[PDB]
Amino acid sequence: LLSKVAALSGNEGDASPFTDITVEGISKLLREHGYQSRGFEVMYNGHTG
Amino acid sequence: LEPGHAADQEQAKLIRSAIEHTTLKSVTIASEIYYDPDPRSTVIPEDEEIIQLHFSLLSFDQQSPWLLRLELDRAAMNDKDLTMGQVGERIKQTFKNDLFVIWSEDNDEKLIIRCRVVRPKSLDAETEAEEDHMLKKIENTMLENITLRGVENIERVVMMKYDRKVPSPTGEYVKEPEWVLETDGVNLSEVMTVPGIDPTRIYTNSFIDIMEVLGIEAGRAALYKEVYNVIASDGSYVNYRHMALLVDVMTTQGGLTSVTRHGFNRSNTGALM
Amino acid sequence: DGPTMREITETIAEAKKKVLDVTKEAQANLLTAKHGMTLRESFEDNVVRFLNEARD
Amino acid sequence: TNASPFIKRDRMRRNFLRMRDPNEYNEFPLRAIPKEDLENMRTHLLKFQSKKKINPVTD
Amino acid sequence: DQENERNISRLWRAFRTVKEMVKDRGYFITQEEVELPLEDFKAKYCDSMGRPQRKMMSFQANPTEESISKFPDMGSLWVEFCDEPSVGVKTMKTFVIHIQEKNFQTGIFVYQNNITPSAMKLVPSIPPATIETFNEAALVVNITHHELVPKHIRLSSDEKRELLKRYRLKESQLPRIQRADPVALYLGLKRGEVVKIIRKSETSGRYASYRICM
Amino acid sequence: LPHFSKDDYSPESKGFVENSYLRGLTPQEFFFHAMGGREGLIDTAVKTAETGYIQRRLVKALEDIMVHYDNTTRNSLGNVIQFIYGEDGMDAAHIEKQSLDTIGGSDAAFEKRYRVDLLNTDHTLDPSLLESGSEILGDLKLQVLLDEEYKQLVKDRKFLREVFVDGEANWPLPVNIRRIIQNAQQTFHIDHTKPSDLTIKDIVLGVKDLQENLLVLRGKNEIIQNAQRDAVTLFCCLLRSRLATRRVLQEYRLTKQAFDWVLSNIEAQFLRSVVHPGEM
Amino acid sequence: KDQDDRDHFGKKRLDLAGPLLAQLFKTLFKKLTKDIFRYMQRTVEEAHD
Amino acid sequence: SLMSCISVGTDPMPIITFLSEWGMEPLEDYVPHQSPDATRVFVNGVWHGVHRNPARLMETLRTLRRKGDINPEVSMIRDIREKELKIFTDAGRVYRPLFIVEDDESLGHKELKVRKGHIAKLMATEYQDIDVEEYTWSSLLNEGLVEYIDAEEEESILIAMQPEDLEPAEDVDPAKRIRVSHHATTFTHCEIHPSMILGVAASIIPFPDHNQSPRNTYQSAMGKQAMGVFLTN
Amino acid sequence: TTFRFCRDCNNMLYPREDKENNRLLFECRTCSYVEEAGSPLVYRHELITNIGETAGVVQDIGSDPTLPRSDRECPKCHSRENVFFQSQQRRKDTSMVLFFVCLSCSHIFTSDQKNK
Ligand SMILES: [Zn+2]
Ligand SMILES: [Zn+2]
């Protein structure tokens, strides 16, 4: 989830163990980019579409 | 416990105290050596009354002036049902009549035992130097080598209420509670003879003592139960015949043969095997 | 969800308060050791039981 | 909120660089012993180890 | 006087166990005398003072008719209770003579604390008669009544011959049971005697095994 | 840790991780959690080595034990470990857990389920359960046969209770009778309403002679025959309980053709469950 | 007082390349000194240069 | 761990002489029954004497080490309960740096001696290399802002997880982890950063505190078997 | 027990009985020096002991940073600051009773409410 946000924002994710970073904070930023807050996406089967 | 008296919790305490090995060391706070000029008057304010009590109610000429005093805990003698009269006799029977003892009553605020060694008619001039040392010896052995009550090698006993399914008078199986004693340490031969327990159901964790007391076949069943418990402890299930075969092999030679190089590997099955 | 987390936080706090009460009785020596166990061992069993049940 | 999920080091370097008495006593002289008598003479300390009073002058 | 009652109760239980042992060995013992009440025991085997007279406790038993048919070689049995605690050679010597004098094929001796080595070594001295020594503390509880102890049945010479013939075995190929085994002592097994162990199996209900004394 | 004062017994001090993996562990919790995990890793290494030695020792002690053609379990020396494998002569691969219907239940339930009477009207058999339900009432020759069957069932319950003191009824047994009965009902499409053509004599004799064909040992001497009878004691108890006269006619509605099919399968299934000689 | 804990890291020492070489060098130098004396003794006794 | 270091050891004789000149009574005239309050002084496990005022002595020793008069690797432990003062100078002791916490009555509560001004000059020298006076790690050590602490000395200090919450005298986000304040007002040291307890291999895991402990151990071993660029040559 | 030591050579004294007066005397086994006893107690063995519960209390115990602080009331000076610690006995049979040391009067009290 953090890596997805970092690539979309062109930043380096901060994954140090003991920080104030929370999963909810990552989700909010991901939603600002037009993606599902929890990282889920609608996918299509490659065999049938 | 006895099937008729299994649910009687009051009788369980009687059996529990009748098998737990307790020594004077576990029911005492401190032991002191006091010197009294004569065996008729006391120097401690507390025992001023006890001597006046026993002496008035009542040989003492040759009693040694060195006194051994034992202070027992009020709570300790109440955790296990005990009275100073019984323990006083216990000391009196360890050494039949070679020392005099007086014990306070339960109503007393402090529980104290006073002991005096009586010297023989012949006078030993050399023993006066070690007279106190001898008292330090017997008191130590009086703290360790005294069996107030219970079976030796029995550390502690705890009461637990188990559920067993017995047939009901109607004909159905119903769960009734019974009081079961669990013990640390094993003395099967002596405990099995204690009155009040059910000798036809006593079980021991160590199958070795089962074999020595009940026989190889009883050891065979006990060995299987021990193995079954280990297998079933984690919830895993193994077919009976697999464990039965292992147990049968372990007891086929009229005894419990280990699975090490000192057991099955010492038989006569060919050097190459 | 939020409501579940609030309930979870309160549930753990209640268990901690229960542990706090026993830790105060032992300090006052008003706690009787369970039969066959020491005062310290009995206290630890009570604390472990409360915390284990709190997680469950 | 998330206290900055990202390690900002690309421009943070630039930002920091951009930011920049009465005579109520007794006094006696102290003179050294002549060294002419200290030669061929050793002065040691003797300590009697006991709880009582030991005085070779009288005891 | 509590200690006096404790010994009497222990002696009564030990007496009952011995009677059951004699009954199980194939001797004629009625069920009524096996279940003798405690008060009856204190009436017939005690005195005015209360202490029991163990000399009178000794009794004689004879093989039952069914046992004679299966084993037509078993004789009478004598059970003796020693009054003094420390068994000496003197009391041992008269006990063996009392057996050899009246053609007793087996004699069970019950002692309180121990038998001196000078007397123990004399036990195997009157063949073909056999002498078995039992400690009273060991007879207080009948081990055969324990749920873990199955039923042991001694096999006759003919039965042993058939057992080996039908399974085509040898005496060395059967499961072994020690002579010093508590159950074997309870049955007085000898070397070469095979006992049929009938025990309950959870896979077949009833299962029959055989063990040869060694 | 060097972050709490001495004599601190609070959960946060002695290793209570209040957070979840989603929320994250605080540095104190992380170290305490790491300490616990190290215990598991050490145990995994130590357990593997110790258990490996145990397995090798067990295998070497029993490697020479085999089931012989006389059904006895013997080692390389020929010594008999067991006079019949598993005390029943069956193969573990063919055993299934089944319920013993006689041991459990109350006495009233036992009487209602198995007892059949033709003289009195307290436990009578409904005449609509068989084609001969009218002439069956008032027969003494068949009544004694039913009495013997009930007497045997009562004896079985007594024996079973003495074996399983705890009253447990679910035990592993070779043949799954419940499945066989279901197959017969579904295979022949039992009507379940039309009265059956079975007779009381056929059922009692059909079950009785079936027990004779359940042969684990085939010796023609008394000792082996007694052993054969003992080996199928528990299975026969299950067989009698399931194939009871009342249960077959009342609960299963079995037909004579269906009943014969069930008996043949039970004989075939039992013979397939016997341990194969030469198995290690 | 409680018995000393053997696992206490404060009672443990780590020997790095420095101390490890020190003891190794000390042993080797001791051997070198012994060899020097043996040559001196041999030269005096055997009357060599 | 990342910030752990091992002492190389120094000569203990200068410290022994220093202790003697500051009132360390020799052991040849120490009568226990005439001074049952003196603190035993140990140097490298050698009982050199006793002191009547350990509190003043420890203050002098601590100040000298912080200013840079005694080698920072020297470890000093004052066991108040046991009345012992142990000084260790031998090599092989594992130690790590920590911040120093003092009263600083100007603010009324304990706070780190290191301030924002010190950090400002720290980064200035860091970024000027890529000319103000040089300011390196040694400067912090000589200024008494950081201190080397070994395992033995940790037994007599109180450390704070972080300066954000534990040092200041003392709604909450539902997503943040439950942090215990510990309500302690006697902190003597502060952790540089809790994440530094990890080693080289464990410092590559992202969010290792959101993982089950055994998984982190597996990654450490597997991180050493991953293809990469061991060297540029 | 109040061990007594010799006066002439500082050796350990031992109890001796004199029948001339049926009293208690302390004599030296090496230098022949006698001293009349003050108390009739000569040996004391303590199975359950409370000696050492407050061992380690010094005039500067409050200077310890590790020791926790508390807000309990000292019942000799009416103060709120104090440091508390558990018993120093390492036997696994002692209760968790706390011992409080006041930083104003150095008075040691206990939180026990059972026996005190
Ligand atoms: Zn002297
Ligand atoms: Zn105060």
Curated annotation (Swiss-Prot), chain D:
Post-translational modifications: Phosphorylated on Ser and other residues by TAF1 and casein kinase II-like kinases.
Compartmental location: Nucleus
Transmembrane segments: none
Lineage: superkingdom: Eukaryota
Function: TFIIF is a general transcription initiation factor that binds to RNA polymerase II. Its functions include the recruitment of RNA polymerase II to the promoter bound DNA-TBP-TFIIB complex, decreasing the affinity of RNA polymerase II for non-specific DNA, allowing for the subsequent recruitment of TFIIE and TFIIH, and facilitating RNA polymerase II elongation.
Self-association and partners: TFIIF is composed of three different subunits: TFG1/RAP74, TFG2/RAP30 and TAF14.
Miscellaneous notes: Present with 1920 molecules/cell in log phase SD medium.
Family membership: Belongs to the TFIIF alpha subunit family.
Protein name in UniProt: Transcription initiation factor IIF subunit alpha
Protein source organism: Saccharomyces cerevisiae (strain ATCC 204508 / S288c)
Full-sequence portion shown in this chain: 16 to 132 of 735
From Swiss-Prot, chain E:
Pfam families per record: RNA_pol_Rpb5_C, RNA_pol_Rpb5_N
Compartments, as annotated in UniProt: Nucleus
GO cellular component: nucleoplasm; nucleus; RNA polymerase I complex; RNA polymerase II, core complex; RNA polymerase III complex
Keywords: DNA-binding, DNA-directed RNA polymerase, Nucleus, Ribosome biogenesis, Transcription
GO molecular function, one term: DNA-directed RNA polymerase activity
The keyword Nucleus belongs to this UniProt entry's keyword annotation: yes
GO aspect biological process, one term: transcription initiation at RNA polymerase II promoter
Keyword Transcription: yes
Family: Belongs to the archaeal Rpo5/eukaryotic RPB5 RNA polymerase subunit family.
Subunit comment: Component of the RNA polymerase I (Pol I), RNA polymerase II (Pol II) and RNA polymerase III (Pol III) complexes. Component of the RNA polymerase I (Pol I) complex consisting of 14 subunits: RPA135, RPA190, RPC40, RPA14, RPB5, RPO26, RPA43, RPB8, RPA12, RPB10, RPC19, RPC10, RPA49 and RPA34. The complex is composed of a horseshoe-shaped core containing ten subunits (RPA135, RPA190, RPB5, RPO26, RPB8, RPB10, RPC10, RPA12, RPC19 and RPC40) where RPA135 and RPA190 form the DNA-binding cleft.
Protein name: DNA-directed RNA polymerases I, II, and III subunit RPABC1
Curated annotation (Swiss-Prot), chain F:
Region named Bridging helix: 27-39
Cellular compartment(s): Nucleus
Disulphide bonds in the chain: none
Modified how: The tandem 7 residues repeats in the C-terminal domain (CTD) can be highly phosphorylated. The phosphorylation activates Pol II. Phosphorylation occurs mainly at residues 'Ser-2' and 'Ser-5' of the heptapeptide repeat. The phosphorylated form of Pol II appears to carry, on average, one phosphate per repeat. The phosphorylation state is believed to result from the balanced action of site-specific CTD kinases and phosphatases, and a 'CTD code' that specifies the position of Pol II within the transcription cycle has been proposed.
Source organism superkingdom: Eukaryota
Family: Belongs to the RNA polymerase beta' chain family.
Function: DNA-dependent RNA polymerase catalyzes the transcription of DNA into RNA using the four ribonucleoside triphosphates as substrates. Largest and catalytic component of RNA polymerase II which synthesizes mRNA precursors and many functional non-coding RNAs. Forms the polymerase active center together with the second largest subunit. Pol II is the central component of the basal RNA polymerase II transcription machinery. During a transcription cycle, Pol II, general transcription factors and the Mediator complex assemble as the preinitiation complex (PIC) at the promoter.
Protein name in the entry: DNA-directed RNA polymerase II subunit RPB1
Shown part of the complete sequence: 784 to 1063 of 1733
From Swiss-Prot, chain G:
Any further remark recorded for this protein: The binding of ribonucleoside triphosphate to the RNA polymerase II transcribing complex probably involves a two-step mechanism. The initial binding seems to occur at the entry (E) site and involves a magnesium ion coordinated by three conserved aspartate residues of the two largest RNA Pol II subunits. Present with 18700 molecules/cell in log phase SD medium.
Location within or outside the cell: Nucleus
Protein name (record): DNA-directed RNA polymerase II subunit RPB2
Source species taxonomy: Eukaryota, Fungi, Dikarya, Ascomycota, Saccharomycotina
S-S pairs: none
Function in brief: DNA-dependent RNA polymerase catalyzes the transcription of DNA into RNA using the four ribonucleoside triphosphates as substrates. Second largest component of RNA polymerases II which synthesizes mRNA precursors and many functional non-coding RNAs. Proposed to contribute to the polymerase catalytic activity and forms the polymerase active center together with the largest subunit. Pol II is the central component of the basal RNA polymerase II transcription machinery.
Residues of the full protein shown: 393 to 441 of 1224
Signal peptide bounds: none
Subunit description: Component of the RNA polymerase II (Pol II) complex consisting of 12 subunits.
Segments forming a coiled coil: none
Record family assignment: Belongs to the RNA polymerase beta chain family.
